[PDB]
Design an enzyme around this catalytic site. Structure first.
Site, PDB file in Angstrom:
ATOM      1  N   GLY A  17      41.888  37.993  33.131  1.00 19.43           N
ATOM      2  CA  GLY A  17      40.600  37.666  32.503  1.00 19.43           C
ATOM      3  C   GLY A  17      39.425  37.979  33.409  1.00 19.43           C
ATOM      4  O   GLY A  17      39.511  37.818  34.622  1.00 19.43           O
ATOM      5  N   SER A  18      38.318  38.404  32.816  1.00 19.90           N
ATOM      6  CA  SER A  18      37.228  38.986  33.579  1.00 19.90           C
ATOM      7  C   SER A  18      35.888  38.363  33.170  1.00 19.90           C
ATOM      8  O   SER A  18      35.648  38.134  31.988  1.00 19.90           O
ATOM      9  CB  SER A  18      37.231  40.505  33.339  1.00 19.90           C
ATOM     10  OG  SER A  18      36.903  41.230  34.518  1.00 19.90           O
ATOM     11  N   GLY A  19      35.038  38.080  34.157  1.00 23.37           N
ATOM     12  CA  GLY A  19      33.651  37.619  33.928  1.00 23.37           C
ATOM     13  C   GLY A  19      32.957  37.384  35.265  1.00 23.37           C
ATOM     14  O   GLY A  19      33.614  36.967  36.222  1.00 23.37           O
ATOM     15  N   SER A  20      31.643  37.620  35.346  1.00 17.79           N
ATOM     16  CA  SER A  20      30.942  37.668  36.657  1.00 17.79           C
ATOM     17  C   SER A  20      31.196  36.492  37.647  1.00 17.79           C
ATOM     18  O   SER A  20      30.958  36.654  38.849  1.00 17.79           O
ATOM     19  CB  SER A  20      29.434  37.891  36.474  1.00 17.79           C
ATOM     20  OG  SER A  20      28.782  36.719  36.029  1.00 17.79           O
ATOM     21  N   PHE A  21      31.695  35.341  37.169  1.00 16.51           N
ATOM     22  CA  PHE A  21      32.091  34.214  38.059  1.00 16.51           C
ATOM     23  C   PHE A  21      33.423  34.500  38.780  1.00 16.51           C
ATOM     24  O   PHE A  21      33.930  33.648  39.521  1.00 16.51           O
ATOM     25  CB  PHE A  21      32.191  32.864  37.296  1.00 16.51           C
ATOM     26  CG  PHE A  21      31.090  32.634  36.269  1.00 16.51           C
ATOM     27  CD1 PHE A  21      31.402  32.248  34.964  1.00 16.51           C
ATOM     28  CD2 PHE A  21      29.746  32.811  36.602  1.00 16.51           C
ATOM     29  CE1 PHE A  21      30.403  32.042  34.025  1.00 16.51           C
ATOM     30  CE2 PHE A  21      28.744  32.607  35.661  1.00 16.51           C
ATOM     31  CZ  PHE A  21      29.074  32.222  34.373  1.00 16.51           C
ATOM     32  N   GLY A  22      33.982  35.695  38.550  1.00 17.33           N
ATOM     33  CA  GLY A  22      35.242  36.119  39.159  1.00 17.33           C
ATOM     34  C   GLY A  22      36.181  36.869  38.214  1.00 17.33           C
ATOM     35  O   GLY A  22      35.934  36.972  37.011  1.00 17.33           O
ATOM     36  N   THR A  23      37.269  37.397  38.776  1.00 16.45           N
ATOM     37  CA  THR A  23      38.326  38.075  38.012  1.00 16.45           C
ATOM     38  C   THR A  23      39.678  37.426  38.355  1.00 16.45           C
ATOM     39  O   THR A  23      39.945  37.111  39.519  1.00 16.45           O
ATOM     40  CB  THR A  23      38.379  39.589  38.340  1.00 16.45           C
ATOM     41  OG1 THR A  23      37.053  40.132  38.334  1.00 16.45           O
ATOM     42  CG2 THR A  23      39.248  40.352  37.335  1.00 16.45           C
ATOM     43  N   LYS A  36      42.019  34.177  41.706  1.00 18.75           N
ATOM     44  CA  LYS A  36      40.631  34.366  41.253  1.00 18.75           C
ATOM     45  C   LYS A  36      39.880  35.094  42.340  1.00 18.75           C
ATOM     46  O   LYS A  36      39.955  34.698  43.484  1.00 18.75           O
ATOM     47  CB  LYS A  36      39.949  33.022  40.974  1.00 18.75           C
ATOM     48  CG  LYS A  36      38.581  33.126  40.300  1.00 18.75           C
ATOM     49  CD  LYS A  36      37.877  31.774  40.155  1.00 18.75           C
ATOM     50  CE  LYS A  36      38.291  31.030  38.889  1.00 18.75           C
ATOM     51  NZ  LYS A  36      37.542  29.748  38.708  1.00 18.75           N
ATOM     52  N   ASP A 129      33.782  20.445  32.555  1.00 17.87           N
ATOM     53  CA  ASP A 129      34.134  21.471  31.562  1.00 17.87           C
ATOM     54  C   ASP A 129      35.567  21.318  31.015  1.00 17.87           C
ATOM     55  O   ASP A 129      36.291  22.296  30.819  1.00 17.87           O
ATOM     56  CB  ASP A 129      33.903  22.875  32.148  1.00 17.87           C
ATOM     57  CG  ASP A 129      33.802  23.984  31.072  1.00 17.87           C
ATOM     58  OD1 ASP A 129      33.436  23.717  29.894  1.00 17.87           O
ATOM     59  OD2 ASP A 129      34.083  25.154  31.429  1.00 17.87           O
TER      60      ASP A 129
HETATM   61  N1  LIG Z   1      43.018  32.660  33.872  1.00 11.37           N
HETATM   62  C1  LIG Z   1      43.850  32.124  34.488  1.00 11.37           C
HETATM   63  C2  LIG Z   1      44.896  31.422  35.180  1.00 11.37           C
HETATM   64  C3  LIG Z   1      44.653  30.617  36.271  1.00 11.37           C
HETATM   65  O1  LIG Z   1      43.312  30.524  36.624  1.00 11.37           O
HETATM   66  C4  LIG Z   1      42.812  30.213  37.877  1.00 11.37           C
HETATM   67  C5  LIG Z   1      43.227  30.912  38.985  1.00 11.37           C
HETATM   68  C6  LIG Z   1      42.687  30.601  40.213  1.00 11.37           C
HETATM   69  C7  LIG Z   1      41.737  29.603  40.313  1.00 11.37           C
HETATM   70  F1  LIG Z   1      41.189  29.274  41.497  1.00 11.37           F
HETATM   71  C8  LIG Z   1      41.319  28.904  39.207  1.00 11.37           C
HETATM   72  N2  LIG Z   1      40.337  27.910  39.403  1.00 11.37           N
HETATM   73  C9  LIG Z   1      40.486  26.607  38.989  1.00 11.37           C
HETATM   74  O2  LIG Z   1      41.116  26.217  38.020  1.00 11.37           O
HETATM   75  C10 LIG Z   1      39.793  25.679  39.921  1.00 11.37           C
HETATM   76  C11 LIG Z   1      39.038  24.507  39.365  1.00 11.37           C
HETATM   77  C12 LIG Z   1      37.703  24.597  38.993  1.00 11.37           C
HETATM   78  C13 LIG Z   1      37.033  23.496  38.504  1.00 11.37           C
HETATM   79  C14 LIG Z   1      37.706  22.292  38.408  1.00 11.37           C
HETATM   80  C15 LIG Z   1      39.033  22.190  38.791  1.00 11.37           C
HETATM   81  C16 LIG Z   1      39.793  20.908  38.715  1.00 11.37           C
HETATM   82  F2  LIG Z   1      40.416  20.660  37.537  1.00 11.37           F
HETATM   83  F3  LIG Z   1      40.828  20.904  39.596  1.00 11.37           F
HETATM   84  F4  LIG Z   1      39.004  19.825  38.974  1.00 11.37           F
HETATM   85  C17 LIG Z   1      39.694  23.297  39.270  1.00 11.37           C
HETATM   86  C18 LIG Z   1      41.853  29.218  37.975  1.00 11.37           C
HETATM   87  C19 LIG Z   1      45.674  29.949  36.910  1.00 11.37           C
HETATM   88  C20 LIG Z   1      46.984  30.070  36.484  1.00 11.37           C
HETATM   89  C21 LIG Z   1      47.260  30.882  35.397  1.00 11.37           C
HETATM   90  N3  LIG Z   1      48.507  31.111  34.856  1.00 11.37           N
HETATM   91  C22 LIG Z   1      48.428  31.932  33.826  1.00 11.37           C
HETATM   92  N4  LIG Z   1      49.501  32.373  33.050  1.00 11.37           N
HETATM   93  C23 LIG Z   1      49.390  33.193  31.919  1.00 11.37           C
HETATM   94  O3  LIG Z   1      48.397  33.467  31.253  1.00 11.37           O
HETATM   95  C24 LIG Z   1      50.671  33.793  31.493  1.00 11.37           C
HETATM   96  C25 LIG Z   1      51.861  32.905  31.271  1.00 11.37           C
HETATM   97  C26 LIG Z   1      51.157  33.521  30.099  1.00 11.37           C
HETATM   98  S1  LIG Z   1      46.831  32.465  33.473  1.00 11.37           S
HETATM   99  C27 LIG Z   1      46.207  31.539  34.774  1.00 11.37           C
END
Ligand SMILES: N#Cc1c(Oc2ccc(F)c(NC(=O)Cc3cccc(C(F)(F)F)c3)c2)ccc2nc(NC(=O)C3CC3)sc12
Ligand SMILES: N#Cc1c(Oc2ccc(F)c(NC(=O)Cc3cccc(C(F)(F)F)c3)c2)ccc2nc(NC(=O)C3CC3)sc12
Lengths: 257, 256
Positions: A17-23, A36, A129
């Site tokens: 997933g993509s958007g200016s707050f990161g990829t 991310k 959020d």
């Molecule tokens: N997109 C995506 C994605 C994913 O995203 C990330 C990745 C790195 C990060 F750093 C964050 N950042 C946060 O969440 C940090 C945060 C911010 C605010 C508050 C809080 C808190 F809640 F902790 F307070 C925490 C999110 C993580 C696992 C994952 N697994 C997937 N699997 C599939 O899709 C396939 C199986 C089908 S997609 C996916």
């Protein structure tokens, strides 16, 4: 302690997933991870600050119902690494592929989501959020609260109205939670009969609109339906906190077959 | 940056097991949690040190296949809180209720165990007591490595048994233990079951006269895996592979 990951350890796989707050990429680092990243050469002062803010929050959390923080890198680029959830967001289940869970399961999902929030609020973390898209259904069993990203349907009146510099509170997260319960018990997003964002904002802000609680599944217990109503109260002060919510769920939960 | 838990938030519940290295209770702190606490009036300087070392190590871990540490209290007593695991140990599955896993899963269990062990060694943590009862099969599908007490000779490398050195433990003694665990997975059995004398097993493994019988592996255990087992079980430390190599070898035959 220090959770910096040395460079050239993380391998980056398919984009997610993509958007200016990161990829966000699926990657390899001691198994499967999510990664991310900021997709630029030199980062700004505002992006660097917010990275340190995200990491500063994540490292304060260790709980089964919260997405597991694993580390960060700044060396080649800015990056945050978490566990790789297998499965789907709640949003994906409920509104895309339309999984139909047993009532017993919906209530469990609710309990866990509440369990995780209880933990964060105990740590003085306000999520800001919470919504069905930031709740992962790991291995189809355990809830993981995260932040996979405005999102209006989950926003309490006092946040929508703004006015105040800081309208966010434990009670705003409760309201968000209340909209998730609505998604769980109805299998739908609220305000589905209205196709205009501005009106929804204006109407929720003014109190002319509330989620239609008659759309809940026939077998959804009265106790649960009353929990919704209290979480969705238009006044902050009347909304319950997660300790009571959690207790509530657990009482009507055991009171079932 | 701190993980202390204020006094009186933990509800200690039912007792699970108890040795002189702490007592483990099932408890409640923001959900079901495991609580390992010292059950004493006043801790002695080296008890206080063991606690700090254990906490020092757990707090260095954040990985899906390592038991999730959550916090500690010294307040009423010394205690460590971790996640509660649902199910039972790999030991219990393999040797007690004798669960019959398909090979797809035995290899998957092998992979996850290796995944966590590579994590530890990258963080410079030597486990020292890896064995199937220290490997919890959480919700019946995720490996959680830890210490689930309530010594253990069948997983000890020859150089460990001999005990010539102040410290015979290495990344490679952990590899050997892993190798014995691969034997359990692939045979459903503990090694040396034809010998009823503990001192003789000790002697002969130490001397190289005794080693696991690899012909007892199940007929559909792929040749790559037997070969991998064999390398992990070599009697010379320096000839045993490290974990990235093991992870790589397993990931190779896994996909095929
Ligand atoms: N997109 C995506 C994605 C994913 O995203 C990330 C990745 C790195 C990060 F750093 C964050 N950042 C946060 O969440 C940090 C945060 C911010 C605010 C508050 C809080 C808190 F809640 F902790 F307070 C925490 C999110 C993580 C696992 C994952 N697994 C997937 N699997 C599939 O899709 C396939 C199986 C089908 S997609 C996916
Ligand atoms: N006993 C137990 C137990 C449990 O034990 C704890 C508790 C607190 C702790 F501090 C530790 N300490 C370590 O693990 C220390 C350590 C040493 C070496 C290496 C490493 C590492 F690998 F992490 F580096 C870590 C262990 C945890 C969950 C749990 N769930 C259960 N469920 C059931 O009884 C079944 C009925 C359902 S029993 C149980």
């Amino acid at each position: 302690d220090d959770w910096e990951i040395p460079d050239g350890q993380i391998t980056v796989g398919q984009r997610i997933g993509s958007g200016s707050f990161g990829t966000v990429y699926k990657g390899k680092w001691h198994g499967d991870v999510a990664v991310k990243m900021l997709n630029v050469t030199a980062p700004t002062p505002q992006q660097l600050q917010a990275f340190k803010n995200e990491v500063g929050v994540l490292r304060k959390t260790r709980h089964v119902n919260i997405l597991l923080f694993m580390g960060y890198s700044t060396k080649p680029q800015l990056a945050i690494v978490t566990q790789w959830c297998e499965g789907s967001s709640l949003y994906h289940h409920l509104h895309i592929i339309e999984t139909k869970f047993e009532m017993i399961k919906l209530i469990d999902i609710a309990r866990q989501t509440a369990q995780g929030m209880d933990y964060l609020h105990a740590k003085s973390i306000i999520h800001r959020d919470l919504k069905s898209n930031n709740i992962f259904l790991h291995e189809d069993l355990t809830v993981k609260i995260g932040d996979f990203g405005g999102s209006i349907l989950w926003m309490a009146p006092e946040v929508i109205r703004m006015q105040d510099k800081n309208p966010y509170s434990f009670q705003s997260d409760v309201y968000a939670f209340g909209i998730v319960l609505y998604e769980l018990m109805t299998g739908q997003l609220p305000y589905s009969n209205i196709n205009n964002r501005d009106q929804i904002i204006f109407m929720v802000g003014r109190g002319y609109l509330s989620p239609d609680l008659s759309k809940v599944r026939s077998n959804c217990p009265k106790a649960m339906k009353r929990l919704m109503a209290e979480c969705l109260k238009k006044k902050r002060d009347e909304r319950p906190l997660f300790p009571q919510i959690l207790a509530s769920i657990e009482l009507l939960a055991r009171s079932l077959p």
